[PDB]
Design a protein around this nucleic acid. Structure first.
Lengths: 58, 58
RNA sequence: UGCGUG
RNA sequence: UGCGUG
């Protein structure tokens, strides 16, 4: 929810492929917690994964 | 160490393929903790994995 | 090395 | 669904 919004803001401000480690630094939660949301967002066609462990708005 | 010995005893007393969930019940530690040792034991040719998430003496 | 796993 | 990941 708040984490979902933070992930969306980081991906949108970046505008390009973002590595999971870079999201950890910006979102201040562990990789597993990020990936739970990222894969849910992916299912929802809110984000895309152009590369392994790499995420973008899509 | 003690967990390694417990895993070895459970696999040897069983004598056949053992599922990771069955090891959890006997060894009273989580699947990740079991798998850390199991894959180290596998590297050491002390156990084998005849099937995914399935383990035996080998 | 991808790991999200329930 | 394999997950051991450092």
């Amino acid at each position: 929810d708040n984490l979902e919004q933070k992930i969306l803001q980081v991906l949108s401000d970046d505008g390009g492929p973002v590595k999971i480690g870079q999201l950890v630094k910006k979102c201040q939660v562990p990789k597993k917690t990020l990936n739970q949301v990222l894969y849910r967002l992916k299912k929802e066609d809110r984000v895309s994964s152009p590369e392994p462990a790499t995420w973008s708005i899509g």
